[PDB]
Structure formats: C-alpha cells, structure tokens
Design a binder for this molecule. Sequence first.
Ligand SMILES: [Zn+2]
Ligand SMILES: [Zn+2]
Ligand SMILES: [Zn+2]
Ligand SMILES: [Zn+2]
Lengths: 437, 335, 88, 48, 54, 109, 449, 124
Amino acid sequence: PIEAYIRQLLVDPDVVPIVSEKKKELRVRPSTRKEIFLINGTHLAVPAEAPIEIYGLKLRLKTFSPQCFMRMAEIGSFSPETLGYVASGANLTNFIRVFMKCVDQETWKKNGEGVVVTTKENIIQFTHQYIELYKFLRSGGHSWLINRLAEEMVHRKLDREDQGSHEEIEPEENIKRVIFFLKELSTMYSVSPVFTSGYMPLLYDLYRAGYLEVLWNPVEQKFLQHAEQREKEQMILQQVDMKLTEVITQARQYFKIMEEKIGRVQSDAIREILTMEGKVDDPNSILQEVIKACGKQEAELITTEYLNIKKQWELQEKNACAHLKLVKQLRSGLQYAELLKVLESIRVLYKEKNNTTNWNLCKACGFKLLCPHVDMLIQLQAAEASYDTMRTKLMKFSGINKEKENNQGLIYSYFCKICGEELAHFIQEDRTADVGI
Amino acid sequence: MIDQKIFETTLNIDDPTNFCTNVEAHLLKELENIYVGKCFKNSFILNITGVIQRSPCFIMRTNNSGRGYMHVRFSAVVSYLNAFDLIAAVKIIKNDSNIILGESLLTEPVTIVIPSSESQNNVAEVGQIVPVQLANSSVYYIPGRQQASATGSIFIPKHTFSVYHVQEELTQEQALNLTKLVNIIEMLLESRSKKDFKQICFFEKLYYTYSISSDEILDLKIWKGPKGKEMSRLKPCNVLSFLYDALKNKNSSLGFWARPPNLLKSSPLAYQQDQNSFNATELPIICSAEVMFVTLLKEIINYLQFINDLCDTFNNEQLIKRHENIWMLIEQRKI
Amino acid sequence: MYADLMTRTGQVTSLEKAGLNAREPSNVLLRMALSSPVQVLTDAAVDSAVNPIYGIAAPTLMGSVPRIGTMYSDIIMDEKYITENYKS
Amino acid sequence: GYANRKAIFGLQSCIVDYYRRVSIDTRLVQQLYGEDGLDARQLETVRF
Amino acid sequence: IIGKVAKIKYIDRSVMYGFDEPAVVDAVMRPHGPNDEIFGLMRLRYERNLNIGD
Amino acid sequence: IVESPSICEGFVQASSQTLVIIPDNERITSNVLTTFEATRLVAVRAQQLAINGSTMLKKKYSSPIDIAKQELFNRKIPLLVMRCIKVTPEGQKIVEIWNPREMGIPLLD
Amino acid sequence: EAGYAEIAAVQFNIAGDNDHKRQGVMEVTISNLFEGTLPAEGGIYDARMGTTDHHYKCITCSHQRKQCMGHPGILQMHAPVLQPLFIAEIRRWLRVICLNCGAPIVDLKRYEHLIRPKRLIEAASSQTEGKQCYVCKAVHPKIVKDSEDYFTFWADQQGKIDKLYPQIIREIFSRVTYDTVVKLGRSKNSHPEKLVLKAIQIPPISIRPGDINNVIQYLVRKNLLIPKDLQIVRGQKIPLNIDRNLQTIQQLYYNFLLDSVPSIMRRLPRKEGRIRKSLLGSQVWSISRSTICGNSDLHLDEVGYPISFARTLQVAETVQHYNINRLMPYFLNGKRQYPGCSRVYKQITQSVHDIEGLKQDFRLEVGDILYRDVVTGDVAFFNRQPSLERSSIGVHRIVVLENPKISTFQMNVSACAWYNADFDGDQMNLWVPWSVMSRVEAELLCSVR
Amino acid sequence: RYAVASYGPTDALTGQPLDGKRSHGGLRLGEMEHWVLTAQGAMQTIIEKSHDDSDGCISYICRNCGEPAIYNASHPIYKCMNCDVQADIGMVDSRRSSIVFQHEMRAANVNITSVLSPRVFQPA
Ligand SMILES: [Zn+2]
Ligand SMILES: [Zn+2]
Ligand SMILES: [Zn+2]
Ligand SMILES: [Zn+2]
C-alpha cells in the first residue's frame, strides 16, 4: 500500500494528468497511455507502461453545460456518479470544487482551470480528497440528491413547455343551391357536404359524381333521379349476389356431407351428372340422390345431419368456456416457463389421455380443447428442442401420406393429420457438420 | 430508496381503433402491464404514477400491418438501492459449495450474493432470514429482470468512523433541499413511535457497537432509545434541530463533525467540535456542509429503516429466537 | 431537373462519382451504391462521416423503405373523433 | 444502361416537398417543380 | 423418380421430379463412370405438340 | 489545448422533440388530399378494418377496400394527415394537422 | 416490450480494440470446428455467435435459424496487426509525427486555413525526411513502403534501415495526443491508435454459412504458433521464423479482408455484389413469368392469365363479419375445385393450417386469413424487362383463362405501348398482390389508366 | 413459363429465394423495378415484395449507443453488449440482406452506429 500504486490508479481518468521532470524523487508508471504536461510546458503523451517521474498533479475543473445534464436526464439511465460529475462540471452542483482547493499556491499556469499540487505531502492530501470525492459520489448520499434534482428539473422543463406555453360565415346563393343539392344527394350517393370557404371539396364531390352541370344549368333533378336509379340497381345486384352465394354455400355443404357419408366414388359420379347438366352448386343434388343410387331417406338423413352440424357449429360459436382463453395464453410464446404451467393447467381438462388420431375434448364444456401435437410441440419448445429435433419428433403426427400424390401445388412443409396445422418445413439438408475437426 | 422518476418509451398498439376509445385508460393499463415490477434504465419500477406527455397515435410506416405506436413520457415511483445499505429481511435460498444466494422480503426486490469465504457468513442455514450489509459496489439493474442483483454480507457493526472538516455552510435553498431529508426522518421516526418499545430497545441494544448491559430509556421528546457510552465531557448535538436552526440561520455549522461508534446512530444527534479531539485513524475529509449533512441524514435514514424492518419482520419471540445463532455471532464481535 | 441539379452549387457538377461527391458529400450509402463501395466506405470511416437517411438508396441499403409517395405524409389516429363516435 | 443508372443515382434524391419545391433533404434544387408546379400527365396543348 | 439413401438410421437423399408437365420414363440404365462406380441415368421424354406460345 | 473526449460529447441518442402544430389559420399546405395521401388513408383504413372491422358505415360491403373507400368518400374515416414541415435544431418539430373529412378527395368512384 | 423505431442517421467510424472487445460475445481460443454434431465452444463455429442450422439454436439470443442474425466474436491476437483497409492512413500518420516523442513535425498552424478533410493529406504530402524535432532532438527518418506487399513499412535514417513491426507502430501512435489529432483535422474517434489491432473481430456465423471459414481457421491456427509473451522494440533483431510467421498472419488477415480488391470486401462491389444484387435488387416469392401473347378480346386494362398459374398464386383475405359469406365458397372448394383455397391462417392457434388436412369445420372463425385462388377481376402487377419508363410496371384486371392448354400471358395489342413489348417471344413478369395495403394501392395508384 | 409459391428454397447467406426456375426459387425484382415502383409511388408494394416476400425481418437497435441489441419475447432477453445497464431497445423493420451487409462492414473494422429517430411528444 505504498503511495506509488495510489498515484497509479489516480492516472486512469482523462482528468489529473502528469507534469514530469527528469530530476525528482517520485516515480510511478501508468496503466494505459497518458497525455501529460512538463516543465517548460510541452504537451506530450506516454505509452501504457513507462517510468515517469511526478513533479506534481493538476485536476482540471471541466466546465460542462446544463444542456448536457438535461440530455442525460432525458436519457434517464445514467449512474449517479456520472450525473453528479457532469452536474459539478456544469455548475449545477458544488461538490468537486469543494473537495478540491487544497492548492499550495498558484505555482504553475496553463489554459484550463484546475487545482495544482506540486509538493510531497499536499499530493497525498490531493489523493485523499480525490478518493473521498468519488467515495461520496458513489455512496448512498449524492444519489438521492442528484436523481431528485434531475427529476425536478425535467419536470420543470415539462411544465415550461406544458403550462407556460400553449372562419367561414355564409356561402352564396349559387353555392347555397349546390349545397342543397349535395344535402339531398347525401342520402343517395357517397357524398357528404362540408362548409369550407374555398368550395373545393364540393367541386371534387361533383366531379367524382360525374355531374358538374349544377353550377350553371338548373337540371339537378334529372341527376337526382339518375342517382336514385343507380342506387336501386346496385342494391338489386347486391341482394341477387348474396342470395346466389348463400345458395352456393349450402349446396357445397350438402355435397361435402355427401362425400363424407357415401364415399368419393358416388359423390364424384353425381358431380359428373350434375356437371353435364349446368346445375352444379344448386340443391337439386338432393333430388338426384333421391332418385339415383339410393333411397330418399338416405338423403333426408343427409339434410338433417347438415342441420345438426350447423347447430353444433352455432353452439361452438356460443361457447364462452374458460379453456378457450387459456389456449390463447398457450399460443403467445411469452416466457416458456409460463407456457409450461399454462399447459399444466390445461392438461387437467383432458378426458381419455387422447394420445393420437383425434382431438382432446374439454370436460367442462364438451368441445375440442387441444390437439396432441400442440401438447408435444409445447413440451419440446419448453424442453430446449432444436428445429431438427423438433421436426423429426413431430413425424408421427404427419398429415396425409402418398394417398394423395400431389394437389398440383408444390409444398415444402408437413402438416398435422389431426387438424391440419403446419408441423414444420423441410427444403434441403443442412450438411454443414460434414467438416468435423 | 423509494423515489419518483421520469421515463420515456415507445408502445406498440395492435388495434389503434379500440385503443383510441379510452387513450388514457389503455395507456396506463399497458404501461402497468409492461413496466411494473421490472428493472429498466438503472432502476426498478414499482408503480406508474401517471403520464406527463404523450405522442399522437402514429401508424407504423415501414410495414403493411396497419398497426400503431405511441411515444409515452411517464412518471413512475421506482426504487434505487445504493451501496452500504441495510436490508433487515434476506431469506437464504441457496447455500452450496460455491456461492450463497439470498432473497429480500422488503419493498426493494433484490437478490443478495453473499461470498462464502468469511467466518460470519460461511455457516448458516437454508430458510433462515438475516439482515444483510451491502458492499461498496453498485447494485446491478439488468434490464427486464424481476429483481436487482447486488452483492452483500451479514451486517456486523464496525469499529471505525469518519471525521468531516466543514468550512462552508448552507444557503436557504441548500437547506430547503434537506427539508425533504428531515421530513423522511420524521416520518420514519413516527413509524418508530407507533410501535412498542421492547423489541425497539432489544434490537438497538444488540446492534450497539459496544456491550450495553445497563438499561436506560434516554428521551429527547422526539426520539427514544437506550443510552450507551459517552466520550469524556463531550455532549452530542441533535442534527435535526441543528439543521432546522441553520435554516433559521441562528447557528454556524463549520468545524469537525463525527459519528463515533459509541454514538446512538439511529438518533438524530452527532458530534461537532471546533478542533478534532477524536482519535481517528483516518485523515479528516475536507468538504462543505452539503456532503456531510446528506451523508449523516442518509445514515440516519438507513439505520431507522433497518430497525423498523427488523421490528416489522420479527413479530414474536419465536422469530427472534429461531435465528439466535446469527445474533450470537453478533454478540461475539462487540467490544 | 438535369440542369437545376447540375448547377445548384454554383458550378456545373457531373452525373458521375465526382459530381455526386460534390452535391452530396455526406450521403455515403448512396455514394457506396453508385460506383465503388470499398473506396467510399474507407473514406467515410476516417472522416467520421455522419449519414442522414433520406432519398432512396440510403433507406434501401439499411433495409427500410424511402419516405416517398404514400410514405411521405404519415397518418395519425383521430383521437377526438373515435372517442365520441366509436365504442370499446 | 450505363447512362441511365448514373442519371438516376444523381437525380433520385430530388423529391417534391410540401411547398412544391424540389430539394435534397434540406437543400433546394428547384424553387418550384418545373417552374410551374404541374404534372407532366396533366398538360394540354393550347394556342394563344 | 430415383431412390437414394445415405447410411448414417437412414437419411433420404432422394431425387424428385420437379416439373409441372408430366413426363414418361423412356430409358433407365446403370452405367459405370470413369471411377468404376455405379451412377443412375434416366431419360425422360415429353410428347410436345405445337401449342400457344411456341 | 483540445483535450481528451468527455461524456458531454459522444452521445448517440438524439434528443427528444416537441410537436409544434401550426394553427389552422396559419397553414400553407393545400386543402386537397394528394393521390398518395388518399391511397395511404384508404390502405390504412382497409387494413385496420381487416384487423378490427368496427365501422359506422350505413351501407354494407363485403371487402375492406370498398368500406375504406366509402368511408373516405362519405367523410367518416377516423384518421388524420400530419404533414411534417420542419425539424428545428432547438428540438421543435413543426407539422401540419389536416382532417381528411374536410378536404377534397382526388379519387374517383 | 421493444417499441417501434426508425433509423434517422448512420455514423461511420474506425473500429478499435475496445469496440471489438465490447461488441464481441465470445473469445475464440481453439481451432477445432465441431465436437460431434454440435459446434465446439471456443471455436470459430461456436453457437454463441449465431446459428445457421436446424440442429441447434443460438446460445446468445435463443432464436432459431431464421430469427438469429448472428453475433460477433473476439480473437485476441498474440501480436498486433495492422488494419488492412486503412494502411494508407497509417502511412500518413507515420509522416507527420516524430517516431521518438510523438509531437508533430510539421507546423499545425500552417494547415489551419484548410478544411479538416484535407489537412492531414496536404500536411503529409510535403517531404518530412530529415526534419529535426523541436522537443526531443531527433531526426525524422523516411517512411518507405515495401514494394513486395501492401502492409510492410521500413524506416530509412540516411541508409540505416529498420522494419516497423505493428507493435512498434502502436507504440508510436499511442504517444500522440488528441490535440494533434484535432488540429490535424481528424476527429477524436479517428485517433491513429485504433489503426493497429490486437483483438480482431470474428464475423458472425450468419455471414459465413457452411472458404472464408477456411481463411479464419488458417489465421487462428497460425496465430496459435506465435508466442503469447512476444515483445517487439525498435532496433531489436527478430528470429526469421517469427518474422515469417508475422508476415503470414498479416497476409492472411489482409486476404481475409482485401484479397485482390475470397474476401469480405469482394462481396460488395460489382453487379453480383451485395449492394446491387441483395439490397438494390431482390428475389421474391408469389411471382410468375411466361411468354406474352396477343388477344384482341381483352380490354387494355386486362391481362389473360392461365388457370394453372391462378391456382398457384394466392390472395390473402382476412375473415371478418362482412366477407364471411363471400369467402365461404372458396373455403369449401379447397384444392379440388376452382375457385378454391389452399391455406388458412388461424388467430386461435397463431399458426398455419392446410385445407386438405382440415375438413371438420363447418365455417371459419372471425379473424382468420384465407389464401384463396386468383379469380377474374383481381388486380395484378404486370412487368417487362428492362423497366425504362415508369409505365413498365402496371396494374391490370386479371381474366383467368379456363383453357388448360394455354400457358401464355395474353393482353390486348394496344396495351403493348406501355411496356414497349411485342409478340416475337418476349416474356413478362406478373405478381398478384395479396396484402390489403398493397392491393389498395394497386387499384388507386398503379392502375394502367 | 414459371410460377412458384408463397415460400420455398432460401439462400443461406442473404435469406432471399434462390435464383430462377432451375433451383425452384423465386424471380428477381431487380434494380430497375424498384426505380419504377418508387417513381409510381408504390411503396406499400415494395414492402410486400422486397420485405414480406423476400427477406424482411426485425432488427433490434439500442437507442443509447446505436449498436444492434438482443431481444426475445420468450425466454426474456433484453440486453445490449455496449452499455448493458442502460439499454433502450427499439425494433426497426429491416431485411436480412441489410443486416448481413452491416455485419460485413463491421468485419472490416468499420463501426456502424444507427441513430434511431428521436421520440416526439405533444406539448401538453
Ligand atoms: Zn371447455
Ligand atoms: Zn443469435
Ligand atoms: Zn521528436
Ligand atoms: Zn446499448
């Protein structure tokens, strides 16, 4: 614990450089490069380690601006030591200038302000004052004070910019009748009248409506009738399209249930006869299945079972069970250690351990709860599973096999056979571990 | 401590239409969901007091999601833990052959890393709770954590002290600033006064630097505690009323100030002299009255909070007598 | 547009690397894309060049999109209109 | 292609601002686009 | 069209027919290369008429 | 003597800005939406409708694009156009706030 | 928790030892590549610097291959190495400062009136050989560039020749004060000390998937040969093996960065470079190309588009209460009829579902995204290269050709004037927008009208 | 003729599709096509094609120091290895080719600090 190493760790900051003379008794070496002064006043530097004699020391009183402290407080994530350092520099506080002023006398002079000490024991006093200065800057004190004053000054600034700081009348008769026309047309066309002084949005509305003749020709009534007519055909076509599409939807539902009940062969044959009839997607496939290939009752049950599935889907829409929200918190990622316990809280609602081939069902309500591959995927995600170790393990849940050679669309991803969810994707093997050691 | 702070952030609004229906309510709810209970910007946020300024709900420009964002400048009550601070409730969680981890049960969620190389903390029991003294190191505030990382050790009262040479006194503003500190002192002191004296004096006597076998009920009409040793003919001076009169400007604060081990630390009294009669092994620290006043008041705050937390946690005789091997180690190191 | 760009500095600049360096010395990313990224990058580092993000090449080289056309004017949510008119 | 690419990389920074000026991020290239502020697609040939 | 697996249990380095228009396998043979080793040679034939865009 | 770098210099985070809204009577920009601004408004509204779907349009359409277009045309779109005029060195950001419910729509339908 | 932000400015600086030490996430200590099927920790392939496989995750960000951008490493060189890009800059700093005291030799005030970019260049351009230093009394030798390589420097003091090793160069540059740097024009961030590296930065794995790895491995292996406690002082004789080892290390680093400018900087310049092929250009999905054809029955704003291509490209429709009835017939057709759909995105599972593996649902849930087939009336971007005018990319209304034997993009002959196209064998691109934002702007802005 | 998919084979380095029909990759929207789309003002189309359909990703940049950060919503990581205590991470919409481009310049001893757009607040 000699003085030399204390002076050595004094060297670390950009403050307190060294004046060096070849004829003295002090001898310390720096830890890094240091920019130093000399007698005769030459500004030089020294490398990381080099024997340098100490004539004396100078702590510079760097003068910052309050704007720098305000900028750091705007950042608001600085250690109290740095904030206090700058505040003392920016004349906002009076700590460094107090712990210093151990000057023996003004025995040396340069540009910047600072405390100068060139002796044998007052340098020890300087070192003690510097160490105690940063001890105060690091301690519990000066941390309440600087943080509080920074918060107060930021709040006062917000008050400065917050608390201390912050026409048409009547149109013309021509535009009066034009705005009357627009008011009457508003309930008839996608136009809303405004009252701007420049008349310009009105001009764009009239131009867009394809009828600017109101301005000079008093023939607005024929355009009003034209707009009423056009709205009428628009509504008629819209309703016709809605009826057509609901008919198409019901017919496709009927044919899908036919496919799921009586098989692909009979369903595709009935599609063939309907295709060479121009009546596909029309519920006369009911009559076709009645008088063809089976009895009327086997189609009556199809209709009733369609209505049953519709009722079941409506009931599922009406569902407000607890499990549903839980599933959402299982599908948000969000801190694996929490989704693991979410899965724990969900798995208590299973019924028959539902290993494979079908959905898990909720005992509380009765509808589907969670596909098993989702459970396995959550377990692997919480179990530090790599993508390859996750893609291969979720292969017993692989979707439809070579049963379908292809659907004319090239796919690079596997899907779950239980629900259809995408398990993973495979394009090419990585083959980068082939170069080993 | 527990103090106010101001933060700036940017929030992502998934559905701007629903969000804009009640902007203030949604903003407070989202800020509480995101930032409450986590470490961010060298602090641990406890509560979101409010939003001072905010930006219009912009629409994100660099993607086709139609999602929104908002710049929020909000004021929040947070906790910053300093060095050499007292925590009187630290439950030991991990005591292995490598390292010791304890958890605090106070309003400053902090994990304590106690080095298992000192005879005080080498032998303990998992599940035991113990007061902990923080080392002279900054408390780590890793962003996104639920706790503050800081090293510490079991608090053994020390035998040393410091002497402050004050040569410049206060002004009016520099005393109105310390008015907040004396307000904290009086609040903690009322908290002390609203509680029974038996465990107060037990803890204060047990954490006295020397051995207090005699019983005394020393009173100041504002602070109550057991009396200990004196220093010859020197009579303490109450720093609270001292600072009050200094604000009234009918007293001079210049001279030597000291807080010796024999002195009643949690009391608002300390020693002042015109010349050092103290047999201190450390050189006097040349300074003004700001630094000495703030340090002494912070020390009084720390010790008052320490005693209050000790009495809050240990309610009956079972709690105090369960950990009596820590307390035995405490008596084993007093003069 | 050609003449006004080439003569905006008081001298007839060119549509080559030398001309771009005169009109837009601080737009390194645009200058990197044009002719020789290595030469421009080396000079930018030693000069401590600060490159504001504008135009097309600078936002494009950084992975963003230029603030042009539909992106020129940003859109903010009408807070006052929604509160009285819409519901949560 | 050699001339087209060099022309674009010099000219692309010119963008019409809210004053119908042509500028480079702060710096005016034209006080008014085309000295008339009009679009090339919206011009009519008219005799005086 | 060509099955090929590398023994590590096995990894599948198969060859798949990635063309929209269907082909017909015209000739399959297993010659020996310059290194005296088997490689697979397959000839796929396409029945091409004149269609729009030719 | 120009000395070693300090903490006052070397900041990377730019200082925050204060949004200065030009008063309505002191605005210079046009009272007519450009095709770019109208297209951006319609696209943003259509995407938000695809997200939320809550609209006050009295008519019924089966596409977010059509609903957004009719909302813009019927002056019922819950959006504003902020035209950034200038960013001042002292920190202010002078902008212009325009309401598309009282500007001329350049689109056609 | 991470808010939305945009890049406003970019600052360019020289990366020193401290920058590499901070930004690096690990220190390379071994030359081994893989410990079995996992990368060896401490090697150049370590997973802390990122991942490029599906067999492991990145240790740093805990992301998969797609979401990990890579993180840099640190390799502590046994001997200092010069920065390949800024070698010339080093030469400048060797011609202005004294090699024994560091003080400037030329008068700084003689270059005050110049602009700071050119101060150092026009100060080092003048001859400085033989000038006598004002503070240490030393004669400045001439700094001659070795003609056989791009980095070696020799000092000639009137016939006395010395080789300036990078450690000597560091010891010379570290003695230079920031006042000299500032008054010579260069910023504080461009101090010459940063021009000599002892801890080089290992680029992240995302930059070198899978030759560059070979160069890095060679550099590490040959760096391990150099003694860790090697010290170099000016005027000291060096064993020839160590000299050639240092030569090999520096040449390997230079070829790693500037090999005849495989190197990092070779990826940038030309047309197939990083900037012009990956940044200014792009490879995209959901796009089609075919030979164009004449069709006089199509409108000028319509394009004939084959049904086979219509069933490949998809349009993303978000399910809501207004389009539940219209989108439903698309759902029920699947991939077995036209028009149908191929893929559904669910908000409930936040995942992607097939249409052939999912047939147990009566209808769709509100909020789902349906990827339906392209139908007649959809808008599409239609492009011919080269794109010289801004009408070269236009939006046409799609007319789907039900004939399975048609494979061409048919358009009206009067629409060729937009693209400068003809039917002698030209091919034109076509991509159908699927995003709502891009689909709106195609109809309003990019329409060929 | 060619028409590929919404997804397929991907370049290892840039994260972009492969080249041409032969590799079952995508087709090129080259330099001249971004000029035309910018001239037309089609910016949301550029986002859809050059980002959503090619290599668009999310880049995390620290505000306090401008260096790339590390964020992960699951397995919470919120850190920055240049400041490490005062990190203020903000997400920016970027593309993988740009991140690769920036890393290559940092590999050449060139420091790349990104100055994020400053926060803007109302004066109320
Ligand atoms: Zn349930
Ligand atoms: Zn990573
Ligand atoms: Zn010299
Ligand atoms: Zn940072």
